[PDB]
């Protein structure tokens, strides 16, 4: 019952996976070839290892933030909320747009879980703290908060966000986007935030820009002295094929 957690344990072969991705990423991205992938894993491991899973700080990931510093085009950034798959498909098609997971640090840890025990210096493959049920300040959660902060700060000009029309309330303040990303959009650099609301399978013919959660988002962004555009993506499949040609 001591160090029993609710969320799933560390991903099988987590060390091998992170390195494999780091090698693969540097091959694809020539500007990040200066990064030593062993050093990245050291800074990654040292963050959460030999430390309690419920008491992680941003300074634990500070050394990893330095190793994985990256300068993507800040006018060509795409945020998302509960639309990871389609947002990635968009950036995979149109290559000049970047999501968080198209950066090194994001690429490494995407769809991965990890944590470590306090006493030992061994990774915990049995279980890891759930954000809601167990502990908010868990390795995964604290990582994503740190990287999403730096990524959101770096953005400028016209930032985009891809939302989900179907999933209940479209904008969610309690989400990582609503809490972290939105609040770190610096108005000095950022000018506009255009929202792309994606529909289901030709279910809603209505306009989802009048949704009160978008009006909230509008109000939030407006109070930061930032413009708020909003568009409807009625056909997602044709939209992906559109940007292709």
């Amino acid at each position, epitope marked *: 019952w001591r160090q029993q957690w609710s969320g799933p344990g560390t991903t099988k072969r987590f060390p*091998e996976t992170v*390195l*494999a991705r780091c*090698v693969k990423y540097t*091959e694809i991205h020539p500007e990040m070839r200066h990064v*030593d992938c062993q050093s990245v894993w050291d800074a990654f491991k040292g963050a959460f290892i030999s430390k309690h899973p419920c008491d992680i700080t941003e300074e634990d990931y500070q050394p990893l933030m330095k190793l994985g510093t990256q300068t993507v085009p800040c006018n060509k950034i795409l945020l998302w909320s509960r639309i990871k798959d389609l947002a990635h498909q968009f950036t995979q098609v149109q290559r000049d747009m970047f999501t968080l997971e198209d950066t090194l640090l994001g690429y490494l840890a995407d769809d991965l879980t990890w944590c470590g025990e306090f006493a030992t210096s061994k990774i915990n493959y049995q279980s890891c703290p759930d954000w809601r049920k167990d502990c908010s300040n868990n390795p995964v959660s604290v990582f994503w908060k740190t990287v999403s902060r730096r990524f959101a700060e770096a953005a400028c000009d016209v930032v985009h966000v891809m939302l989900d029309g179907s999933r209940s309330k479209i904008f969610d303040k309690d989400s990582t986007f609503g809490s972290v990303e939105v609040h770190n959009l610096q108005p000095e650099k950022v000018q506009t935030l255009e929202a792309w609301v994606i529909h289901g399978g030709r279910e809603d013919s209505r306009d989802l820009c009048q949704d009160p959660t978008i009006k909230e988002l509008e109000s939030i962004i407006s109070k930061r002295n930032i413009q708020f555009s909003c568009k409807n993506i009625y056909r997602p499949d044709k939209f992906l094929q559109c940007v292709k040609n």
Partner: antibody
Amino acid sequence: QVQLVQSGAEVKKPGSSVKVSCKASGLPDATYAIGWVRQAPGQGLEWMGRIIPRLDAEHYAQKFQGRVTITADESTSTAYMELSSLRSEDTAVYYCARGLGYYLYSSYYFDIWGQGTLVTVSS
Amino acid sequence: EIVMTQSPATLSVSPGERATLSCRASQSVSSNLAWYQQKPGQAPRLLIYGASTRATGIPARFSGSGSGTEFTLTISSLQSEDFAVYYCQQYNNWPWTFGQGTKVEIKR
């Protein structure tokens, strides 16, 4: 010091699969990279993919991906490449080579190559 | 993928003359460009990497230069043993791509 020795040439039927070996020897470190290149008349030198035997990490070119799978036996220091759904255009000399770069996991350019294996796809 | 285009197709020079092989990348490849030498019935031999840097045990005769979309290989005091097909290879963009080749022929 390093030497790559590939398997011999052979004939294969259209649609069948081939598996070419590559026994490395005299490798300085445990972390190395084994690239794969084929040479066909008309197409020329085509990049296929890499492997990092320790990490068990593979990265393929989009053209071949799906058909190509590179495996490796880390103890014998032998890399393998399997190419399936063989067509007439896959008749070529398949090379392996040690990947070079600033790091030991890098495979950008290649200095030591294998002897090459002429796979012929014919009924 | 990036299309490496070498020129000329073939080149005919006497021993002692300076062979000048060209290489054009469809898009910029920084200085991530390697040169190779393939003699008959052999695997390629790495001459240059990083645009200009020679490999181990490669004569000073062979000289790489250029960056972006325009590279060059220069063979100073050409010899008869320098009969080969010379290839370039970008490694700035995955997947790696090679040129079609530049065959050097010897005049006697």
